[PDB]
Amino acid sequence: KWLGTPIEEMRRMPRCGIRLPLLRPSANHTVTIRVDLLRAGEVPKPFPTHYKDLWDNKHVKMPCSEQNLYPAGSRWELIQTALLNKFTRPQNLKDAILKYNVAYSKKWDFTALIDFWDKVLEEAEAQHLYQSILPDMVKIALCLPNICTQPIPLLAAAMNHSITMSQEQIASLLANAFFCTFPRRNEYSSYPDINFNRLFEGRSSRKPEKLKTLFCYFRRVTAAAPTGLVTFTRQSLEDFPEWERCEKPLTRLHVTYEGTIEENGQGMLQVDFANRFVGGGVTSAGLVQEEIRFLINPELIISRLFTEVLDHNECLIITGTEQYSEYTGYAETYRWSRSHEDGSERDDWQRRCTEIVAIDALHFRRYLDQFVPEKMRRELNKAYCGFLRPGVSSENLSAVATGNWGCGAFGGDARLKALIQILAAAAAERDVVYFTFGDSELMRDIYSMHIFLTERKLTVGDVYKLLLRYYNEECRNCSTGPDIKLYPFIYHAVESC
Ligand SMILES: Cn1c(=O)c2c(ncn2Cc2ccc(CC3C(=O)NC(=O)NC3=O)cc2)n(C)c1=O
């Protein structure tokens, strides 16, 4: 069921972790809670004590700002009046949300919300939804100015910057996104959507499963406030390796066709197969790896409030999100299963020991395009950025938990992408744990190539130069896919030398 290094020999957080420094705000680290009062098992206290507002192009525009206006009245006062009404039928909730979104009263479809409430839920489940969950969501949404008291900077392009906030603050913000209260988000063309209006549209059979997953989270965090923190870090590198000259050896590999990144990769650097707009279609139509992870760990979704579209040299690293739901299936078969009791330990900043990196692979309209050297180097550098932790010893780096990044809809070749990730992890001095989700032949193929290359002592540079040879000798002048596939080429090239 698995091959390579036993997964028990791979490094995992928290045990491999370095001692964290004292949490403190700085020019490159926004911290929205009182660090002097951070205590295990206690709800973090916001800093500052009273709400402070910034309404500009460098920060989130909060719905509770005095500058949030509507024809001139306070839009926040209007939001409060709209949402503080009894809901008893789904049209009530549609009408409430549109009271402060009048310009979208014809554009925004709520069919999936109406159908979930009227045509999917049983009567008692609907009753719990509108008598308990929705009012509790309103109340934490309207509590926003007492909870998120500090302006949140945008993580804009080329910024190296972290935001550390409480799970409770994220809950209040996500409740606002659900009720579609974020102004000017319906100057943000380079940011993902944040308001949930596209979750309410259409008749996809997966919308009830998305809604069940999110309401599971909203029921949990409004019933009992979570006590931990989450860190969002935008990382962009200015210097990338000279891959052809890299003399580093390959690291260890565990590869398996069973298990999942989230369950079996606990304490490891977990890859999110991201869209450059992070989260992809989580609050619209998509439901593959990235969207599933954003639904079962919804605190990931708030990255869309403040994370600008990723450039080629950038990633987003999120530490501390909690798993609230279990699921079955994938894509068209995804179903919400039950609530999840996250058993991850917390670090000395009270963050769950769960580290997720969003890295976006390229979309290849034509299969052979991905073997062009600039396109291979692009993917190597993206993965490297996602894996590198500058100034951390290899002993304190967990293994990378990943799989067929960019394959499927984006057209990536699984065997090439496996090799690219292996090279990037080697250069970042991390081991690899690779999940092939049922593809046992791919498991065997990746293991066999990895052991071949390691037993022959080939460096990262040795391998990269073979990839260039493959392009130049089998791809560049190809007429049709090439006659010879990548791994057969590599075997023949190395063995004949
Ligand atoms: C990353 N990862 C997986 O690869 C995975 C998985 N469970 C099964 N698989 C394998 C797999 C791969 C491709 C498709 C096709 C496809 C579709 O049929 N319909 C769409 O809409 N999109 C699509 O890509 C389905 C299934 N889990 C939990 C996971 O995390």
PDB file of all heavy atoms in Angstrom, residues 115-133, unseen atoms left out:
ATOM      1  N   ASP A 115     -33.121  26.349  -2.033  1.00  0.00           N
ATOM      2  CA  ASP A 115     -33.271  24.907  -2.221  1.00  0.00           C
ATOM      3  C   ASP A 115     -32.669  24.128  -1.058  1.00  0.00           C
ATOM      4  O   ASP A 115     -33.180  23.070  -0.676  1.00  0.00           O
ATOM      5  CB  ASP A 115     -32.605  24.459  -3.521  1.00  0.00           C
ATOM      6  CG  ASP A 115     -33.352  24.907  -4.762  1.00  0.00           C
ATOM      7  OD1 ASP A 115     -34.469  25.465  -4.657  1.00  0.00           O
ATOM      8  OD2 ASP A 115     -32.798  24.690  -5.868  1.00  0.00           O
ATOM      9  N   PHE A 116     -31.563  24.615  -0.503  1.00  0.00           N
ATOM     10  CA  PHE A 116     -30.990  23.943   0.652  1.00  0.00           C
ATOM     11  C   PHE A 116     -31.980  23.954   1.803  1.00  0.00           C
ATOM     12  O   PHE A 116     -32.302  22.914   2.380  1.00  0.00           O
ATOM     13  CB  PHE A 116     -29.689  24.629   1.058  1.00  0.00           C
ATOM     14  CG  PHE A 116     -29.039  24.033   2.262  1.00  0.00           C
ATOM     15  CD1 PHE A 116     -28.485  22.747   2.207  1.00  0.00           C
ATOM     16  CD2 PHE A 116     -28.953  24.753   3.442  1.00  0.00           C
ATOM     17  CE1 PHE A 116     -27.861  22.202   3.318  1.00  0.00           C
ATOM     18  CE2 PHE A 116     -28.334  24.211   4.564  1.00  0.00           C
ATOM     19  CZ  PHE A 116     -27.795  22.929   4.496  1.00  0.00           C
ATOM     20  N   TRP A 117     -32.513  25.129   2.093  1.00  0.00           N
ATOM     21  CA  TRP A 117     -33.425  25.319   3.214  1.00  0.00           C
ATOM     22  C   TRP A 117     -34.746  24.589   2.999  1.00  0.00           C
ATOM     23  O   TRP A 117     -35.249  23.920   3.910  1.00  0.00           O
ATOM     24  CB  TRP A 117     -33.628  26.817   3.375  1.00  0.00           C
ATOM     25  CG  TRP A 117     -34.436  27.336   4.521  1.00  0.00           C
ATOM     26  CD1 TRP A 117     -35.600  26.827   5.045  1.00  0.00           C
ATOM     27  CD2 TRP A 117     -34.171  28.548   5.226  1.00  0.00           C
ATOM     28  NE1 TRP A 117     -36.057  27.652   6.055  1.00  0.00           N
ATOM     29  CE2 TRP A 117     -35.183  28.705   6.189  1.00  0.00           C
ATOM     30  CE3 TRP A 117     -33.150  29.512   5.147  1.00  0.00           C
ATOM     31  CZ2 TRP A 117     -35.221  29.799   7.046  1.00  0.00           C
ATOM     32  CZ3 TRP A 117     -33.192  30.591   5.999  1.00  0.00           C
ATOM     33  CH2 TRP A 117     -34.211  30.723   6.937  1.00  0.00           C
ATOM     34  N   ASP A 118     -35.343  24.722   1.803  1.00  0.00           N
ATOM     35  CA  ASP A 118     -36.667  24.179   1.542  1.00  0.00           C
ATOM     36  C   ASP A 118     -36.680  22.753   1.018  1.00  0.00           C
ATOM     37  O   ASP A 118     -37.650  22.025   1.261  1.00  0.00           O
ATOM     38  CB  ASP A 118     -37.394  25.042   0.508  1.00  0.00           C
ATOM     39  CG  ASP A 118     -38.011  26.275   1.103  1.00  0.00           C
ATOM     40  OD1 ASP A 118     -37.902  26.463   2.330  1.00  0.00           O
ATOM     41  OD2 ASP A 118     -38.641  27.041   0.331  1.00  0.00           O
ATOM     42  N   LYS A 119     -35.674  22.350   0.249  1.00  0.00           N
ATOM     43  CA  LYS A 119     -35.749  21.109  -0.498  1.00  0.00           C
ATOM     44  C   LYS A 119     -34.722  20.060  -0.097  1.00  0.00           C
ATOM     45  O   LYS A 119     -34.804  18.932  -0.597  1.00  0.00           O
ATOM     46  CB  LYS A 119     -35.591  21.389  -2.001  1.00  0.00           C
ATOM     47  CG  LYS A 119     -36.516  22.480  -2.515  1.00  0.00           C
ATOM     48  CD  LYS A 119     -36.483  22.538  -4.034  1.00  0.00           C
ATOM     49  CE  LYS A 119     -37.619  23.371  -4.610  1.00  0.00           C
ATOM     50  NZ  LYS A 119     -37.341  24.831  -4.506  1.00  0.00           N
ATOM     51  N   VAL A 120     -33.741  20.395   0.741  1.00  0.00           N
ATOM     52  CA  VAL A 120     -32.728  19.446   1.193  1.00  0.00           C
ATOM     53  C   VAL A 120     -32.893  19.125   2.674  1.00  0.00           C
ATOM     54  O   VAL A 120     -33.057  17.965   3.053  1.00  0.00           O
ATOM     55  CB  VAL A 120     -31.304  19.966   0.889  1.00  0.00           C
ATOM     56  CG1 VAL A 120     -30.241  19.020   1.476  1.00  0.00           C
ATOM     57  CG2 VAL A 120     -31.123  20.109  -0.604  1.00  0.00           C
ATOM     58  N   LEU A 121     -32.942  20.152   3.514  1.00  0.00           N
ATOM     59  CA  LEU A 121     -33.044  19.932   4.951  1.00  0.00           C
ATOM     60  C   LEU A 121     -34.392  19.340   5.323  1.00  0.00           C
ATOM     61  O   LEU A 121     -35.418  19.648   4.712  1.00  0.00           O
ATOM     62  CB  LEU A 121     -32.843  21.244   5.700  1.00  0.00           C
ATOM     63  CG  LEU A 121     -31.479  21.895   5.516  1.00  0.00           C
ATOM     64  CD1 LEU A 121     -31.445  23.174   6.330  1.00  0.00           C
ATOM     65  CD2 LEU A 121     -30.398  20.923   5.958  1.00  0.00           C
ATOM     66  N   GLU A 122     -34.383  18.470   6.330  1.00  0.00           N
ATOM     67  CA  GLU A 122     -35.620  18.075   6.981  1.00  0.00           C
ATOM     68  C   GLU A 122     -36.169  19.253   7.775  1.00  0.00           C
ATOM     69  O   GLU A 122     -35.461  20.231   8.049  1.00  0.00           O
ATOM     70  CB  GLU A 122     -35.382  16.875   7.900  1.00  0.00           C
ATOM     71  CG  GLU A 122     -34.573  15.755   7.261  1.00  0.00           C
ATOM     72  CD  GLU A 122     -34.315  14.599   8.212  1.00  0.00           C
ATOM     73  OE1 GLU A 122     -34.364  14.813   9.443  1.00  0.00           O
ATOM     74  OE2 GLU A 122     -34.068  13.474   7.727  1.00  0.00           O
ATOM     75  N   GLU A 123     -37.445  19.150   8.160  1.00  0.00           N
ATOM     76  CA  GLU A 123     -38.095  20.269   8.829  1.00  0.00           C
ATOM     77  C   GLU A 123     -37.351  20.661  10.102  1.00  0.00           C
ATOM     78  O   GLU A 123     -37.102  21.848  10.342  1.00  0.00           O
ATOM     79  CB  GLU A 123     -39.558  19.934   9.134  1.00  0.00           C
ATOM     80  CG  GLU A 123     -40.237  20.965  10.015  1.00  0.00           C
ATOM     81  N   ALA A 124     -36.967  19.679  10.928  1.00  0.00           N
ATOM     82  CA  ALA A 124     -36.293  20.019  12.181  1.00  0.00           C
ATOM     83  C   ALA A 124     -34.905  20.590  11.936  1.00  0.00           C
ATOM     84  O   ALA A 124     -34.427  21.418  12.719  1.00  0.00           O
ATOM     85  CB  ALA A 124     -36.205  18.799  13.102  1.00  0.00           C
ATOM     86  N   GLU A 125     -34.241  20.166  10.858  1.00  0.00           N
ATOM     87  CA  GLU A 125     -32.937  20.725  10.546  1.00  0.00           C
ATOM     88  C   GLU A 125     -33.064  22.168  10.086  1.00  0.00           C
ATOM     89  O   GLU A 125     -32.256  23.024  10.468  1.00  0.00           O
ATOM     90  CB  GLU A 125     -32.245  19.868   9.487  1.00  0.00           C
ATOM     91  CG  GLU A 125     -31.949  18.454   9.955  1.00  0.00           C
ATOM     92  CD  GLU A 125     -31.544  17.530   8.818  1.00  0.00           C
ATOM     93  OE1 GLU A 125     -31.943  17.786   7.656  1.00  0.00           O
ATOM     94  OE2 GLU A 125     -30.827  16.543   9.090  1.00  0.00           O
ATOM     95  N   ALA A 126     -34.078  22.458   9.263  1.00  0.00           N
ATOM     96  CA  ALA A 126     -34.331  23.843   8.883  1.00  0.00           C
ATOM     97  C   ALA A 126     -34.633  24.690  10.111  1.00  0.00           C
ATOM     98  O   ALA A 126     -34.163  25.828  10.218  1.00  0.00           O
ATOM     99  CB  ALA A 126     -35.486  23.923   7.880  1.00  0.00           C
ATOM    100  N   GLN A 127     -35.401  24.137  11.054  1.00  0.00           N
ATOM    101  CA  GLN A 127     -35.775  24.885  12.249  1.00  0.00           C
ATOM    102  C   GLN A 127     -34.549  25.262  13.057  1.00  0.00           C
ATOM    103  O   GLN A 127     -34.415  26.402  13.515  1.00  0.00           O
ATOM    104  CB  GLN A 127     -36.740  24.064  13.100  1.00  0.00           C
ATOM    105  CG  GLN A 127     -37.858  24.891  13.664  1.00  0.00           C
ATOM    106  CD  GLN A 127     -38.545  24.213  14.815  1.00  0.00           C
ATOM    107  OE1 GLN A 127     -37.941  23.415  15.532  1.00  0.00           O
ATOM    108  NE2 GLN A 127     -39.808  24.529  15.009  1.00  0.00           N
ATOM    109  N   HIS A 128     -33.644  24.301  13.250  1.00  0.00           N
ATOM    110  CA  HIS A 128     -32.403  24.583  13.949  1.00  0.00           C
ATOM    111  C   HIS A 128     -31.598  25.626  13.191  1.00  0.00           C
ATOM    112  O   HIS A 128     -30.952  26.488  13.799  1.00  0.00           O
ATOM    113  CB  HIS A 128     -31.619  23.285  14.128  1.00  0.00           C
ATOM    114  CG  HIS A 128     -30.350  23.446  14.901  1.00  0.00           C
ATOM    115  ND1 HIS A 128     -29.113  23.149  14.368  1.00  0.00           N
ATOM    116  CD2 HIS A 128     -30.124  23.886  16.159  1.00  0.00           C
ATOM    117  CE1 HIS A 128     -28.179  23.408  15.265  1.00  0.00           C
ATOM    118  NE2 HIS A 128     -28.765  23.856  16.361  1.00  0.00           N
ATOM    119  N   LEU A 129     -31.654  25.586  11.853  1.00  0.00           N
ATOM    120  CA  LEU A 129     -30.902  26.553  11.065  1.00  0.00           C
ATOM    121  C   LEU A 129     -31.395  27.972  11.319  1.00  0.00           C
ATOM    122  O   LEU A 129     -30.588  28.870  11.589  1.00  0.00           O
ATOM    123  CB  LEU A 129     -30.971  26.216   9.573  1.00  0.00           C
ATOM    124  CG  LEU A 129     -30.248  27.208   8.657  1.00  0.00           C
ATOM    125  CD1 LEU A 129     -28.719  27.202   8.866  1.00  0.00           C
ATOM    126  CD2 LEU A 129     -30.579  26.878   7.214  1.00  0.00           C
ATOM    127  N   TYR A 130     -32.714  28.206  11.245  1.00  0.00           N
ATOM    128  CA  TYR A 130     -33.174  29.590  11.342  1.00  0.00           C
ATOM    129  C   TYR A 130     -33.475  30.045  12.760  1.00  0.00           C
ATOM    130  O   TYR A 130     -33.516  31.255  13.002  1.00  0.00           O
ATOM    131  CB  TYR A 130     -34.396  29.850  10.454  1.00  0.00           C
ATOM    132  CG  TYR A 130     -35.675  29.084  10.741  1.00  0.00           C
ATOM    133  CD1 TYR A 130     -36.494  29.406  11.817  1.00  0.00           C
ATOM    134  CD2 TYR A 130     -36.095  28.085   9.876  1.00  0.00           C
ATOM    135  CE1 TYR A 130     -37.688  28.705  12.038  1.00  0.00           C
ATOM    136  CE2 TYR A 130     -37.268  27.397  10.074  1.00  0.00           C
ATOM    137  CZ  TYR A 130     -38.063  27.702  11.152  1.00  0.00           C
ATOM    138  OH  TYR A 130     -39.229  26.986  11.322  1.00  0.00           O
ATOM    139  N   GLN A 131     -33.649  29.126  13.705  1.00  0.00           N
ATOM    140  CA  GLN A 131     -33.848  29.531  15.089  1.00  0.00           C
ATOM    141  C   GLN A 131     -32.557  29.631  15.893  1.00  0.00           C
ATOM    142  O   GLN A 131     -32.514  30.384  16.876  1.00  0.00           O
ATOM    143  CB  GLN A 131     -34.781  28.552  15.793  1.00  0.00           C
ATOM    144  CG  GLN A 131     -36.200  28.562  15.276  1.00  0.00           C
ATOM    145  CD  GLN A 131     -37.100  27.702  16.127  1.00  0.00           C
ATOM    146  OE1 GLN A 131     -36.628  26.809  16.819  1.00  0.00           O
ATOM    147  NE2 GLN A 131     -38.400  27.965  16.085  1.00  0.00           N
ATOM    148  N   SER A 132     -31.515  28.891  15.513  1.00  0.00           N
ATOM    149  CA  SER A 132     -30.286  28.831  16.303  1.00  0.00           C
ATOM    150  C   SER A 132     -29.054  29.251  15.513  1.00  0.00           C
ATOM    151  O   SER A 132     -28.400  30.231  15.885  1.00  0.00           O
ATOM    152  CB  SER A 132     -30.103  27.417  16.871  1.00  0.00           C
ATOM    153  OG  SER A 132     -28.995  27.362  17.758  1.00  0.00           O
ATOM    154  N   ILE A 133     -28.711  28.542  14.435  1.00  0.00           N
ATOM    155  CA  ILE A 133     -27.444  28.797  13.746  1.00  0.00           C
ATOM    156  C   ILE A 133     -27.410  30.201  13.147  1.00  0.00           C
ATOM    157  O   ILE A 133     -26.451  30.952  13.363  1.00  0.00           O
ATOM    158  CB  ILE A 133     -27.194  27.724  12.674  1.00  0.00           C
ATOM    159  CG1 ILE A 133     -27.125  26.335  13.316  1.00  0.00           C
ATOM    160  CG2 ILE A 133     -25.912  28.043  11.901  1.00  0.00           C
ATOM    161  CD1 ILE A 133     -26.851  25.201  12.298  1.00  0.00           C
TER     162      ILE A 133
END
